[PDB]
Design a protein around this ligand. Structure first.
Ligand SMILES: C[C@@H]1CCO[C@H]2Cn3cc(C(=O)NCc4ccc(F)cc4F)c(=O)c(O)c3C(=O)N12
Ligand SMILES: C[C@@H]1CCO[C@H]2Cn3cc(C(=O)NCc4ccc(F)cc4F)c(=O)c(O)c3C(=O)N12
Ligand SMILES: [Mg+2]
Ligand SMILES: [Mg+2]
Ligand SMILES: [Mg+2]
Ligand SMILES: [Mg+2]
Ligand SMILES: [Zn+2]
Ligand SMILES: [Zn+2]
Lengths: 64, 47, 258, 242, 259, 47, 242, 64
DNA sequence: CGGGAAAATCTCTAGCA
DNA sequence: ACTGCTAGAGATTTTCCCG
DNA sequence: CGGGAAAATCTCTAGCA
DNA sequence: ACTGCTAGAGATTTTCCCG
C-alpha cells in the first residue's frame, strides 16, 4: 500500500536554493511536498525548502 | 526600531531616514514621511 | 578625548571610520558609530541579490521592442518555457488577449510583470480576474525582479538574429525563435530543452500532488515531540512533523507516535 | 536485477508492457523493454488534427490533440495560406507537433503552409474531431455573452474546455491528459536513446563469445545472449566497442 | 550516420551541441565541431577580465561631466591618488595644461586615457612629447581599460555630493572632494589614504632602485645552471634567481653552480 | 591559424571570421579583411 | 631584543637619534624612540611659504616647500582672495600642508582665504624662498621661448626645476627630496600613533608593580620601569587596562 | 656591506596578482626589483611577477 | 593499484529598454 | 507586504577506460 | 587547554557617459 | 601590438583576552 507510493514520491528529483546562495544545488531526493514547504533529503540531509525555491522534476534521462 | 536609507527608483541620490515597517529577503517595506514604500535590499541600508 | 576632535573632523570631511580611527586613535566601534550618524554618509545598500519566485504556476511577462515592433513575451519561471508574439501596439487589449491565450493553454496561477502601462491596464486586470490569475508587480524600476523574463528577452532576441534571414516578417522570425528555444536548445537543471522541462515540471507537480493526497488519505499518525501533531515523513532516525503550520525535523528521541 | 525470471514468467502469463513490469518489479526500463520485445506474441502522441470552423463569418482554426482532446483555437481573419502557416508555426513552437491531419483545404495545401511544415519538421496527412469541435462550439455559445469580441470568446471557451472540463477515466481535464501523454512520450524517447547508445557494445562473459549488453549498474551487468537474459558480476564481463 | 541529419537540423535551427548530441546520439566532440562551423552561432566571447597596468609611472586620465561642467581627472593607478580640476571647455589646450601641471608635480612616465577627442588633440600630443610622457589609449569604446580612473570618477562624484553644499563654485567643491579623497579616506592595500599610499609607492620605488644599484655595483656572481654565465640576482633558501638572455629564472641550489 | 569572431565597439552584432595576428592577456590583435584591429578578449571568441 | 644595553652605550657615546639606533641595532622603532626620549641631554615637513611674483603684469603664485625646495607655481588672473584661496585649496588637496608662511598681503588676509585655511585644516603665519624664486625665474626665462603663453612657461619651468634640476647631498631633485621628507613624516606619525595607543597599558612582571610597556613581540615583551628597560617572557608578564 | 642592504631590500612588502586572479594577494616580501619583473617570496614560494602587476610598498604602519 | 583523455563540474560575463 | 537570471566559454577536476 | 567578543578576512554589488 | 576597478556592507573566521 504505502510502500510503493512512498518509493515513487521519493523517486522525484528536487533542486533547491538557500536565502543567500544564488546557484541551484544538486538533485536532492524528494521526501514530501507541502503547500509552500517541501521536505527533501540531500545526501541524508533532511531539509525544508520553501516551495518558491524548489523545482521538483522526475528527470527522465536519469529515470531511464 | 531601525533607520533605513534608501534609493527609490532611477533616482541616484539616496533618501532617509525612514522607519522599517517590515523586512524580508531581497526587499524591505519602509515608511518614509508616512509614505509606505518597497525597496530592494540592494537599494537600502539598515542601521 | 578624541571623540570631539573626530566629530569636528567628520562634520567637514565626512571621513570613513577607518580614517577617523587611524588618525584619532579611536576604537573602530566608536568610529563606525560616529560615521553611522551622518545622513550624507549612507550612500550604499547591502550587497546581495534576492531570489525570484520559481513556483510551477508563475509566469513572468514583459514587452521587448525589436525593429520598431512590440514583442510581448511570457516565460515559465520554473522551466524557462517561453511564449512570444508580435503585437501591433503596446496597448492593454492586446496584452489581455495574449495573457488569456496563455492561460487557456497552460495552467497559469500568477503573473509577475513590471509596472508597464499595458500590464497595469484595467482590461488586463479584468482578464486576470476572470481566468483566476494573481497579478504580481515588481518594485518600480527594478528590472532584476523580472530577471528571468528579461534574460529571455535577450536570449530570444539573440535567436531572432540567427533566423531573421529565413523569414520575411518579424512575426514569423519571432515564432521560429520561440520554437528553436523551446525545442532545439538543451541545458538547464535537467539537461532538457525548455519544452521538455516544462512538461516534466507540470507532470511532476500533478503526480506528486496525487500521490501525496493518497498517502495522506491512507496514512495518518499523531505524534508527540519533546502536542498532538501530524506526521509527514519518517526515516533514518528522523521524523517530519506538522504542527500549527510548522514543519519540523526531529529525531526519534523526543518523538513518539500513537 | 533479481526479479528477472519473475518478470519473464509474469510477462508470459499476462503479456504486460515493459512500463508496468519495470515499475512493479523495480527493474531498469531497458531490461523490461528488451524482455517485452523478445515475446513476438506480446508485440501517436504528437499528432494533431486541424479544422477551420466558421462562426459569425469569421474563421476559427482549431487544432485538436487526438490523444487527449486538448484544444488550441485561434480566430484568423482570412482563409489564406499565410494565416494557417503562422498558426501551424505557433502550434509547433508551443507543442511538439510531428504530424498534422487536414481536410485538404485550398489553404492547407498552399506552398506557404508547405514551407512552414517543412521548416518546423512536420508531416502533413490528408471521430474525436467532431465531438471535440462541437464541444468547443457549445462552450463558445455559452461564454459569448461575456466577451466583447469573438476572439475573446474563443479564448475563454478554450480555457474552460482545457482546464475546467474534467472528464475521462481519472476525471482529468485535457491539460492533465496532454501533459501526461507528452511526459510518457519523453520517457519513451529517452529509453530509446539510451538503448541506441548502449546497443553498440559487446560483452564477453566468463571466454564466452560476444553478447548483447543491456544494462550496466554498480557491480552487476545485465546482458542478452541468445534470448537469454543473464546478470554477471562486473569482473567476469569484459566490455568492448564494436 | 546521424551526422548528416544533425547537420541539416543545425542549418535550420542553429541548435547547441547539447541538443544535437542528445537528439542524434552524437558524441559531444562532433556536436561541438559542427556547432563551431556556424558563423551565426559565435555570439559570445571569453568570460574573463584583463588587468590594467599598475606600474608606478602609470597615470590614467578621463573627463567627467558634472552640473554641465567638465571636470578633468587623473589617477595614479599604483596608489589611487587623484588630481582633478574643472575646465571650462573640453578642448585640447586645457587638457594639455592640466597634464603639464600634473607632470611637473609628480613623476608621470605614461598616461593611459580613453580615445576622447581632447586626449587625442595634437596639442596634448606635443605636451606629452615635451615632458617625456608616453601616451597610451584603450580599445575604442572599452571603458574597462580605464577602469581605475572610471571608478575614481564615481567615487569623486560621490564625494562632491557630500560637500557640494559647503561651496558655491563647482571648482571649489571639486577641490574639496579631491582633498577629502586624498587625505581623509583610508583603505587600499596598505591601510593608507591615497596620498600616503602614493608617497609610499614613490619612496619605495626610489629606495629599491638605489639599493639594487648599489648591490649590483658591489655584488657580482656568474652562475652555471644545467648552461651559460648567467647573472645572479638572488640566492639562498634553497633557490637561486639568475638572469640569462633576458630570462629571470629561479632554479634550486642543485644543478646551480656559482663562481 | 585561428578563427576569431569579435564585436568591435558599440556594435552588438558580431563579426568575423578573422585571422589572429597576435594574442595577449586581456586583448587580441586580429586581421579582418586585411584590417588590423584590437579587441578585448571579452569581445572575441577564438577557435 | 638583547641589544638594548648596546643601544644605551652607543647613544651615550654618540648621542644618536632613534632612527639610526633602530636601523643599525635592528631594534623596534618604539624602544629606540623611548630610549632617545629618556636621554634629556640627547633631546616641520608640512610647512610651505607662498609668494606672488609678478611677470608681464601677471601674478604667479609660487608655494615653496622649505624642507626640500619643491616648487608649485600657478598663474592667477588677479590678486584677489578667491584665487589665493583656490590655490591654497589645490595645494592642501595635493600635498599635506600644515602651516603656510605669507607676507601678509591684502589678498592673503581675505576672509575667503581665512575660510579656505580653516576648512582645509591649515594655520596661517606671517632664506630659501629668495633662492628658490630666483631659480624659478631663471628657468622661466630659459624656457619662455618654447611656450606661447605664460602659464605654459610657468608649468614648464616648474617641471624643469622639480624633476630635471638635481642637486643636494645625494644629487636628488626636489621631487625626491619632498617624497622622502613626507615618507619620513609618515613614519614619525605612525610611530607616534603606536606609542599613544600602547602607553595606556600597564605590565606586571615576576608581582612587581605596574611598569611602562614598550613593545609586545612573539615570545618576549619589552617594558620600561624606572628608566630601566627590561625584556620579560610573556608568561611572567600580565597586561592590564585602565 | 651587502648584508644590511639585502636585509632592508627584503623588508619591502609586495602585492601581486596573476593573469586570471583579479584580487591583489597578501604582502609577499620583496626579494629583487627588475626593469619589468620583480622576484618575490610569498611564504617561502619564490615567484616572478611582472612589474605591471606589482605594487611595492614599505608599510610604515607595519614597520613601526 | 596508475595514467589518459573525455566528461562533468566550476567560475565568470554580457545584457536584458 | 518582495526578491537577478540565463546560456555560453574556458579551466579544472573527476572518472571510466586502458594497463 | 576552552570561550567571547572584537578584529580581520571574505564575498558581493553599484556605478563609473 | 592590451588588459575592470574601487569602496562599502554584511557574513564568517580567526585570534587576543579572559578563565
Ligand atoms: C515603462 C516600463 C515600466 C517601468 O520600468 C520601465 C523601464 N524598463 C527597464 C528595463 C531595463 O532596464 N532592462 C535592462 C535591464 C537592466 C538590469 C537588469 F537586471 C535587467 C534588465 F533587463 C526593461 O527591461 C524594461 O522592460 C523596462 C520597462 O518596461 N519599463
Ligand atoms: C567620447 C569618449 C571617447 C570614446 O568613448 C566614449 C564613451 N565613454 C563611455 C564611458 C562609459 O561608458 N562609462 C561607463 C562605464 C561602463 C563600464 C565600465 F566598465 C566603466 C565605465 F566607466 C565613459 O566613461 C567615457 O568617459 C566615455 C568617453 O569618454 N568617450
Ligand atoms: Mg518591461
Ligand atoms: Mg524588459
Ligand atoms: Mg572618457
Ligand atoms: Mg569616463
Ligand atoms: Zn559624514
Ligand atoms: Zn548554427
Amino acid at each position: 500500500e504505502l510502500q510503493k507510493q512512498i518509493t515513487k514520491i521519493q523517486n522525484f528529483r528536487v533542486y533547491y536554493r538557500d536565502s543567500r546562495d544564488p546557484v541551484w544545488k544538486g538533485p536532492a531526493k524528494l521526501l514530501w511536498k507541502g503547500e509552500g514547504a517541501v521536505v527533501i533529503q540531500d545526501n541524508s540531509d533532511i531539509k525544508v525548502v520553501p516551495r518558491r525555491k524548489a523545482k521538483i522534476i522526475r528527470d527522465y534521462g536519469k529515470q531511464m | 526600531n531601525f533607520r533605513v536609507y534608501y534609493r527609490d527608483s532611477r533616482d541616484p541620490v539616496w533618501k532617509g531616514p525612514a522607519k522599517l515597517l517590515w523586512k524580508g529577503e531581497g526587499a524591505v517595506v519602509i515608511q518614509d514621511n508616512s509614505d509606505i514604500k518597497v525597496v530592494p535590499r540592494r537599494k537600502a541600508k539598515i542601521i | 578625548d578624541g571623540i570631539d576632535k573626530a566629530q569636528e573632523e567628520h562634520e567637514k570631511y565626512h571621513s570613513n571610520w577607518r580614517a577617523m580611527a587611524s588618525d584619532f586613535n579611536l576604537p573602530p566601534v566608536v568610529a563606525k558609530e560616529i560615521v553611522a550618524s551622518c545622513d550624507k554618509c549612507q550612500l550604499k545598500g547591502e550587497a546581495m541579490h534576492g531570489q525570484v519566485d520559481c513556483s510551477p504556476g508563475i509566469w513572468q511577462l514583459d514587452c521587448t521592442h525589436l525593429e520598431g515592433k512590440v514583442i510581448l513575451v511570457a516565460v515559465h519561471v520554473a522551466s524557462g518555457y517561453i511564449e512570444a508574439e508580435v503585437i501591433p501596439a503596446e496597448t492593454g487589449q492586446e496584452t489581455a488577449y495574449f495573457l488569456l491565450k496563455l492561460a487557456g493553454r497552460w495552467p497559469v496561477k500568477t503573473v509577475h510583470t513590471d509596472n508597464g502601462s499595458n500590464f497595469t491596464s484595467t482590461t488586463v486586470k479584468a482578464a486576470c480576474w476572470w481566468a483566476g490569475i494573481k497579478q504580481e508587480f515588481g518594485i518600480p524600476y527594478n528590472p532584476q525582479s523580472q530577471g528571468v523574463i528579461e534574460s529571455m528577452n535577450k536570449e530570444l532576441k539573440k535567436i531572432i538574429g540567427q533566423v531573421r534571414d529565413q523569414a520575411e516578417h518579424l512575426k514569423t522570425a519571432v515564432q521560429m525563435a520561440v520554437f528553436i528555444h523551446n525545442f532545439k536548445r538543451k541545458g538547464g537543471i535537467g539537461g532538457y530543452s525548455a519544452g521538455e522541462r516544462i512538461v516534466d515540471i507540470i507532470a511532476t507537480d500533478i503526480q506528486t500532488k496525487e500521490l501525496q493526497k493518497q498517502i495522506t488519505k491512507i496514512q495518518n499518525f499523531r505524534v508527540y515531540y519533546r502536542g498532538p501533531a501530524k506526521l509527514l515523513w519518517k526515516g533514518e532516525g528522523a521524523v517530519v512533523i506538522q504542527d500549527n503550520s510548522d514543519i519540523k525535523v526531529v529525531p526519534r528521541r523526543k518523538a513518539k507516535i500513537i
